[PDB]
Amino acid sequence: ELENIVANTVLLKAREGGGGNRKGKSKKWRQMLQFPHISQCEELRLSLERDYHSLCERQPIGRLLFREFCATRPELSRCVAFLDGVAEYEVTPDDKRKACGRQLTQNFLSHTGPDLIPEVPRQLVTNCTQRLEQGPCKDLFQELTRLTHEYLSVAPFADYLDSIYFNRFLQWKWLERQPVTKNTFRQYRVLGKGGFGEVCACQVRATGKMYACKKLEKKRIKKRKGEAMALNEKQILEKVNSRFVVSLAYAYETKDALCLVLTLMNGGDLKFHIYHMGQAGFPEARAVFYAAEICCGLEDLHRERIVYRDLKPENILLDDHGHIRISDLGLAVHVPEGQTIKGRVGTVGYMAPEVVKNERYTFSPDWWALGCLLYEMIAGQSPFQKKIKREEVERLVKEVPEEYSERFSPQARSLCSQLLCKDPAERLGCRGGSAREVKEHPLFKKLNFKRLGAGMLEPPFKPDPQAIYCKDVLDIEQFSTVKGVELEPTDQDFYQKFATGSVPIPWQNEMVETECFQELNVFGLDGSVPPDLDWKGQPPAPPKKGLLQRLFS
Ligand SMILES: Nc1ncnc2c1ncn2[C@@H]1O[C@H](COP(=O)(O)O)[C@@H](O)[C@H]1O
């Protein structure tokens, strides 16, 4: 008994605040994150490409340092501010947009004050001013935005690369490139049973940020020969950078397992929220909201020529504020432009007709599963799965249309139905509109999609922070740890391929949030209080006025 309540309260403290001043941070982090010697970077300097878009735009710390560098030179300092303005304007609602836009116009484009960029054609200045007033469109400034970046990305770029700031960046880079091992994290109670090992929470000792650790047991992998299936999930997760898919931050090995460190979703899975949450299912508004999100998620994966192939309740999780992210991408795969793929894989009941039939496809199955899941949310039960045997369900799918209980509204039916159309080439989404058409379904009346993608819409249910949304430890299974299997040289080569260590972007963001960046990066503030006496114990000319007062009365 003891054990459960323990790890439970433990986790809550960590999720709460941790250890007081040190927000989860180990009492010796400053050391864990001590920068390397400048010379230790020279190697890494040569490796990194001199690519503007890479160093100044994609890599948060990179960008930050670049901004920080710009802050010094007024001509740049103002370029940056300008970009930050447009970026805002381009998300500012219509009723306020014109008011906001005009301020930037008068601030940065004033023909009176110092000029913005070295060579700006007077045409495009006035040309923009006009187009503004009559109908303030999104891409109003794109002309200048493009020109601005063109400016920076040349000489002010080279300048930064050849600045101290860039050295500082190299240091930061070195840190992320450092080996990661068991030691980098703390462990906690498990959270669920994965396909290849337990998933438990974990904290980065040095930064104190929370993560999930998907463990995949080295042995259980060779037995099932699911070596690709692992590497696959990783390589994908690595590439992805969507708001609706869990980001991966680390990939490392232990004696027994390979690990994926993932965005810790505190609200648990939907399989929990539907079944073990009093009466089954969700009110319309709610189920809608999720589908709507999961929609964008799918959009994003598809926009990246990737098909999920495993949308279901086990694999939709919730964050602290109450948004969702698709997870477990073991089955996912990349669809080359202008091509199709055959593959009979998934979870029974959620696999689309053409899948079961072993037919070629692209993105169909996902939109199918969204139906299945949207159904399973409102209805409170799988539309096809009381325990039912294997083959029958497959048949039940191939031919038998869906049956509605009295919970579905007029429109709630129309969507689910269109998504559960057994004819792939006529199924909603797959018709030739991608997500665009699914979004345009009238069910999503009072939801502004542009905003939802920014996460600027409040979810109709905020989880209780003090709650743990999953089973207790001894209430979770464990398959027989079959012996009679020994790891051989050939496997190590793969383990090399797998454990990349820290993932650049997410690593960096962690650094920023946990404030380590700002706390550690800044140089020239500590110890800079100009000494009372010189090296030979003498006062300067003239002697510190406060010092005398400390030696007399
Ligand atoms: N990032 C995460 N945050 C919280 N729980 C998770 C996370 N990833 C997986 N789990 C839980 O562990 C189970 C097994 O992981 P998976 O096999 O990846 O779905 C899932 O069904 C979830 O309940």
Side-chain angles (χ1 to χ4, degrees):
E1 170 56 45
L2 126 92
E3 219 157 311
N4 288 18
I5 343 135
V6 174
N8 271 32
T9 330
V10 171
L11 203 89
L12 287 158
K13 181 84 174 173
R15 189 186 282 183
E16 197 88 34
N21 326 342
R22 30 173 174 84
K23 296 160 183 174
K25 312 176 197 65
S26 172
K27 61 182 161 169
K28 55 156 144 198
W29 55 287
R30 302 178 160 269
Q31 288 199 352
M32 304 192 170
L33 308 178
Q34 172 182 6
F35 300 126
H37 301 96
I38 300 296
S39 70
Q40 269 179 289
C41 292
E42 193 64 54
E43 196 174 309
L44 175 67
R45 179 206 299 279
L46 295 184
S47 342
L48 294 174
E49 190 188 354
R50 279 195 168 159
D51 170 48
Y52 175 82
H53 182 52
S54 188
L55 309 167
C56 300
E57 284 195 284
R58 277 182 98 265
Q59 300 190 71
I61 295 199
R63 183 147 163 256
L64 257 167
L65 292 160
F66 186 61
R67 285 171 142 274
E68 285 189 345
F69 164 83
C70 285
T72 82
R73 281 144 56 158
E75 67 275 31
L76 308 183
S77 181
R78 53 173 305 152
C79 289
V80 188
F82 172 86
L83 290 182
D84 301 341
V86 182
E88 198 171 305
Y89 158 101
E90 281 199 55
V91 199
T92 322
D94 298 48
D95 37 54
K96 301 268 185 183
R97 190 185 296 199
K98 49 186 181 179
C100 187
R102 273 175 205 159
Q103 205 204 359
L104 306 186
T105 319
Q106 217 138 67
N107 278 220
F108 303 97
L109 308 169
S110 172
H111 45 274
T112 317
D115 204 4
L116 195 81
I117 74 149
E119 288 170 41
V120 53
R122 321 219 166 209
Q123 278 289 325
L124 298 152
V125 185
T126 321
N127 177 228
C128 190
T129 329
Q130 189 184 335
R131 165 71 164 154
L132 147 86
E133 217 151 69
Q134 53 202 51
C137 62
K138 313 162 194 176
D139 37 299
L140 177 60
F141 302 105
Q142 263 194 32
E143 205 80 277
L144 300 168
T145 287
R146 182 200 61 242
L147 266 153
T148 287
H149 284 274
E150 277 194 80
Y151 171 46
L152 303 166
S153 89
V154 201
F157 189 44
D159 274 17
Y160 154 111
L161 293 164
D162 201 7
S163 91
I164 183 170
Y165 287 77
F166 187 49
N167 288 2
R168 196 59 151 199
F169 178 95
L170 298 186
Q171 282 170 332
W172 278 108
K173 192 77 201 181
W174 186 94
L175 285 161
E176 75 156 75
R177 290 290 204 72
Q178 293 310 296
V180 185
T181 65
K182 172 168 195 139
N183 259 41
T184 325
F185 318 93
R186 291 172 178 111
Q187 298 284 273
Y188 291 112
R189 52 101 74 203
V190 305
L191 269 124
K193 187 187 201 170
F196 296 88
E198 327 107 298
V199 170
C200 63
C202 63
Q203 204 172 29
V204 178
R205 267 160 86 184
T207 69
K209 207 204 169 167
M210 302 278 23
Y211 284 103
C213 184
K214 191 163 166 172
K215 296 194 176 199
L216 316 177
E217 296 181 314
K218 285 175 176 176
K219 292 181 168 183
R220 277 204 197 172
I221 295 157
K222 201 171 186 178
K223 197 200 168 189
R224 299 205 214 184
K225 281 167 184 177
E227 287 134 285
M229 217 202 88
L231 173 69
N232 205 60
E233 190 176 327
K234 184 264 189 171
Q235 284 178 337
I236 295 160
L237 277 171
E238 201 180 21
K239 197 193 183 194
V240 181
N241 184 44
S242 150
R243 198 188 301 280
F244 304 95
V245 193
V246 291
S247 75
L248 169 89
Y250 301 93
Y252 70 96
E253 58 177 348
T254 65
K255 261 175 196 174
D256 302 65
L258 313 173
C259 305
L260 294 194
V261 189
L262 294 176
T263 311
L264 174 54
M265 296 293 273
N266 285 335
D269 54 82
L270 284 203
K271 201 186 192 182
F272 193 95
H273 269 267
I274 304 159
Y275 287 50
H276 316 317
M277 204 59 61
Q279 202 194 0
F282 312 127
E284 189 156 302
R286 182 163 165 179
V288 171
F289 193 84
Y290 292 175
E293 283 216 317
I294 299 149
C295 189
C296 307
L298 293 169
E299 182 176 31
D300 281 4
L301 297 157
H302 299 163
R303 188 170 285 203
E304 289 287 314
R305 301 295 297 159
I306 265 187
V307 53
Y308 185 19
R309 294 204 289 190
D310 211 23
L311 178 52
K312 50 201 259 270
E314 292 89 310
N315 301 326
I316 302 297
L317 322 178
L318 275 149
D319 79 345
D320 302 4
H321 299 80
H323 305 272
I324 51 85
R325 276 164 204 250
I326 305 152
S327 57
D328 184 20
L329 269 56
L331 306 183
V333 79
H334 163 269
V335 175
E337 203 217 319
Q339 281 203 26
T340 44
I341 47 129
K342 45 157 204 167
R344 194 179 181 165
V345 284
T347 309
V348 281
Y350 306 97
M351 301 167 77
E354 62 282 27
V355 183
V356 201
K357 275 185 183 171
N358 203 324
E359 291 185 351
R360 288 206 167 279
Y361 53 92
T362 70
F363 304 104
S364 347
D366 283 350
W367 294 119
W368 174 260
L370 176 49
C372 307
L373 195 63
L374 180 59
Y375 185 107
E376 199 185 351
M377 279 194 288
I378 298 172
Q381 201 207 4
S382 174
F384 300 94
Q385 198 287 294
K386 288 154 196 168
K387 299 186 176 183
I388 312 160
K389 280 189 177 180
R390 190 181 180 181
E391 216 152 314
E392 184 66 54
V393 189
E394 295 177 56
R395 186 201 68 86
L396 183 61
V397 171
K398 288 184 188 180
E399 291 129 28
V400 179
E402 51 276 8
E403 324 82 43
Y404 292 94
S405 74
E406 284 212 29
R407 290 188 180 189
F408 300 85
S409 79
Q411 297 288 9
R413 185 179 193 177
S414 62
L415 181 57
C416 266
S417 183
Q418 274 167 104
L419 285 179
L420 286 157
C421 168
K422 300 178 196 295
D423 186 16
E426 218 166 329
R427 195 181 303 154
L428 198 63
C430 309
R431 284 180 209 159
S434 290
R436 184 72 60 251
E437 63 184 18
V438 184
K439 301 169 186 283
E440 270 182 16
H441 187 284
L443 182 53
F444 311 118
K445 280 176 188 175
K446 289 173 184 174
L447 290 85
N448 198 326
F449 263 113
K450 211 161 96 172
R451 286 173 196 171
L452 177 69
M456 289 176 182
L457 276 149
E458 191 153 315
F461 170 69
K462 175 168 181 169
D464 182 274
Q466 299 282 310
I468 303 155
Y469 301 92
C470 68
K471 302 175 181 179
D472 270 36
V473 182
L474 297 169
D475 299 40
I476 305 160
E477 297 168 309
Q478 182 198 339
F479 205 86
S480 295
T481 55
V482 179
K483 209 188 175 183
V485 51
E486 289 206 56
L487 312 164
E488 289 175 4
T490 322
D491 311 320
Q492 280 187 209
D493 296 354
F494 161 72
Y495 301 140
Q496 205 163 58
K497 266 190 159 197
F498 179 81
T500 306
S502 21
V503 194
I505 300 85
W507 186 85
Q508 284 173 47
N509 301 297
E510 161 172 355
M511 288 296 155
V512 174
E513 308 162 0
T514 52
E515 299 217 29
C516 310
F517 179 64
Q518 187 53 32
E519 181 63 47
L520 266 175
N521 178 51
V522 50
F523 122 86
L525 244 165
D526 289 333
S528 53
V529 213
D532 298 70
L533 306 168
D534 71 29
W535 76 274
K536 52 178 205 275
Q538 297 287 284
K544 278 272 186 179
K545 293 189 177 191
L547 164 63
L548 307 158
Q549 280 185 340
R550 208 160 73 258
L551 290 174
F552 298 89
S553 179

